[PDB]
């Protein structure tokens, strides 16, 4: 046998370890060391009875074994040099007796091909030249349209900045009008469930009027057009804000990663509610279990504002602090200031640690990330009517945003806020 610690696997993952055996192949992920005392590893054994074919050659990336087996797993092995052909083949010629050809599955790179849905993978042959077979273990979600247009949404679990490497979101594809065929075998995996539901609630991103319900560890959004799933781990922050006129309330859910239809991005789920939406709700849970499920935060039956109820339930699920609207009063006792953006008028709301600009696109400007701000002004009689401009820079993203249409009183109140917060005002 032989030992190497620089052998890679799952290229969107960090290196692993091998320890070759006569009986089989033993793969160990690189050990995780906590406090230099806790040593964590997951060993896997692939005995010789599972090997089916070997197509290792120099035409592909990362010159090293590319093994397919009958255990429904493909070991797309990486992390060996050019001189290991003789070594590995000398080791393998004892029993398996299989010649590794110079494939090089396909390199022509022309779009045309044929797709066949295999037992666990999707083989893509450009006239007998395979191009891709992704196993079904790595898929996350699948969406299909009326053109039999296929979009495969993935969700890779990042660990740290350095070892993440390359990592794919989407593999999309069109299929012509295949007769009496559809995408049968692709959808043969897990969405993974067992509290409360709502009816006829008004959402903005995507814009519409649908309903939302909560399972044990996620929420499902349903409508007559689409259905969406949102996991609690992806939810980051919950915000509640009023309108200028107080008549409407806004619930903004900051989530990461965004929920996409393949090609649209919805960073912040903005939900509009009315001031008269004061009703009672019922919790579909046992009178002894709901203590442990909600950590005693909420009662089984309670009547209050529906916005407050939904926000409190969301905070209870997330186990994080809430954001309260600021007590800083704008012009005419108002809580925000309106101005134009991307040819669209929207509001600015100050807060403890960030500015929130609504509503298309909902933009967060945290004060810590804020590098500096500047003011630009002209000299004219019309200056009193929504003229002054404020340009902020964020250094972390190198993002400069200019905020047009500010009047004298609004500029003065903003500047008063700005000195009181002790932010660097360039001039």
């Amino acid at each position: 046998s032989t030992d190497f610690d620089r052998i890679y696997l799952n290229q969107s993952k960090f290196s692993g370890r091998f320890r070759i055996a006569d009986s089989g192949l033993g793969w160990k992920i690189s050990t995780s060391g906590g406090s230099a005392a806790n040593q964590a590893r997951k060993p896997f054994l692939l005995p010789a009875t599972e090997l089916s074919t070997v197509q290792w050659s120099r035409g592909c990336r990362g010159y090293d074994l590319k093994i397919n087996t009958k255990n429904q797993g493909v070991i797309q092995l990486d992390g060996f040099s050019q001189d290991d052909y003789n070594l590995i083949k000398n080791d393998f010629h004892r029993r398996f007796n299989i010649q590794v050809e110079q494939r090089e599955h396909s390199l022509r790179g022309w779009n045309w091909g044929k797709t066949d849905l295999a037992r666990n993978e999707m083989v893509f042959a450009l006239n007998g030249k395979p191009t891709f077979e992704i196993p079904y273990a790595r898929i996350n979600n699948t969406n299909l349209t009326s053109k039999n247009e296929v979009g495969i949404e993935f969700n890779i679990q990042d660990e740290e900045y350095q070892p993440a490497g390359d990592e794919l979101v989407e593999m999309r594809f069109y299929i012509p009008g295949v007769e009496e065929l559809k995408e049968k075998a692709d959808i043969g995996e897990v969405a993974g469930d067992a509290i409360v539901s709502f009816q006829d609630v008004f959402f903005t991103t995507p814009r519409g009027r649908y309903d939302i319900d909560i399972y044990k560890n996620s929420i499902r959004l349903r409508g007559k057009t689409y259905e969406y799933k949102l996991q609690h781990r992806q939810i980051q922050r919950i915000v509640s804000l009023p309108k200028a006129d107080d008549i409407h309330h806004l619930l903004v859910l900051a989530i990461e990663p965004p929920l996409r239809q393949g090609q649209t991005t919805y960073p912040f789920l903005v939900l509009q509610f009315q001031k008269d939406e004061e009703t009672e709700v019922q919790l579909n849970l046992e009178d002894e279990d709901y203590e442990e499920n909600y950590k005693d935060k909420l009662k089984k039956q309670y009547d209050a504002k529906t916005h407050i109820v939904l926000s409190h339930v969301l905070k209870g699920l997330t186990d994080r602090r809430v954001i309260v609207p600021g007590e800083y009063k704008s012009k005419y006792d108002q809580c925000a200031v309106s101005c134009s953006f991307k040819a669209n008028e929207g509001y600015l709301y100050p807060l403890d640690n960030a500015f929130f600009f609504l509503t298309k696109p909902t933009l967060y400007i945290p004060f810590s990330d804020v590098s500096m701000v500047n003011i630009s002004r002209a000299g004219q009689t019309s200056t009193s009517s929504r003229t002054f401009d404020l340009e902020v820079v964020l250094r972390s993203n190198r993002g400069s945003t200019t905020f047009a249409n500010i009047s004298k009183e609004e500029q003065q109140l903003l500047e008063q806020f700005l000195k009181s917060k002790n932010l660097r005002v360039k001039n």
Binding site: K114, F132, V169, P176, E256
Partner: protein, 224 residues
């Protein structure tokens, strides 16, 4: 074609950053740990989005619904070889984890752009007794931005515009390619002019031209 054999490897064997090749007019991408090349002529466009800290790159190929406005139409690369066959339409990526992605995205932005004439029969020149020649004639469109004076001659199977008065370059026009010869005089006009309209446009000077004209000026305004 992208490559043809194993001997020509990519620029680096361990391609842990998405690689863009320029010599072979193709680029490789790994779709989850195993390669594929695709072509610039097989590409349409790319786009970007940055959100919080996460980033989403979209790359769109040339395919039905993407290259062409209406499906089932007739296009050179995808449809002509096979009209009812599988192709790919667009993909996405998220490479927030390394500050090498904007560089390759701008290399995409210029690689998409980085990359044309029907050849007539050669016009036989013959200096016969019946020879047509007149001077101070100017051709339009001109070979270069400056204005070219020269002479014009008629032959038995085309029209020849001899440059040797200026630069000795040779431009040939095929009789069958000429569709309409028309004269227009100076009666109320500032020029006196011969237009030949062609069915098969020709490449000349710096560009591709269909309409060809030869005239003499009749200007009278002076600023002396």
């Amino acid at each position: 074609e992208s490559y043809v054999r194993d001997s020509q490897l990519p620029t680096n064997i361990r391609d842990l950053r998405i690689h863009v090749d320029w010599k072979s007019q193709t680029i490789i991408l790994p779709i989850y740990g195993r390669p594929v090349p695709f072509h610039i002529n097989s590409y349409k466009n790319g786009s970007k989005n940055e959100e919080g800290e996460y980033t989403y790159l979209r790359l769109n190929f040339n395919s039905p619904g993407s290259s062409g406005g209406i499906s089932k139409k007739v296009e050179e690369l995808p449809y002509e070889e096979s009209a009812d066959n599988q192709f790919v339409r667009s993909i996405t990526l998220r490479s927030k984890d390394g500050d090498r992605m904007s560089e390759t995205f701008k290399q995409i932005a210029d690689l998409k752009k980085e990359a044309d004439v029907v050849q007539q029969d050669k016009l036989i020149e013959n200096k016969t007794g019946r020879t047509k020649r007149l001077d101070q004639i100017f051709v339009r469109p001109n070979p270069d931005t400056k204005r070219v004076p020269s002479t014009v001659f008629i032959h038995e199977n085309g029209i020849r515009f001899q440059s040797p008065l200026r630069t000795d370059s040779r431009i040939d026009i095929l009789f069958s390619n000429i569709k309409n010869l028309i004269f227009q005089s100076c009666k109320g006009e500032l020029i006196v002019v011969i237009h030949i309209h062609l069915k098969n446009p020709i490449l000349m000077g710096k560009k591709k031209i269909q309409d060809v004209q030869f005239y003499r000026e009749a200007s009278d305004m002076s600023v002396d």
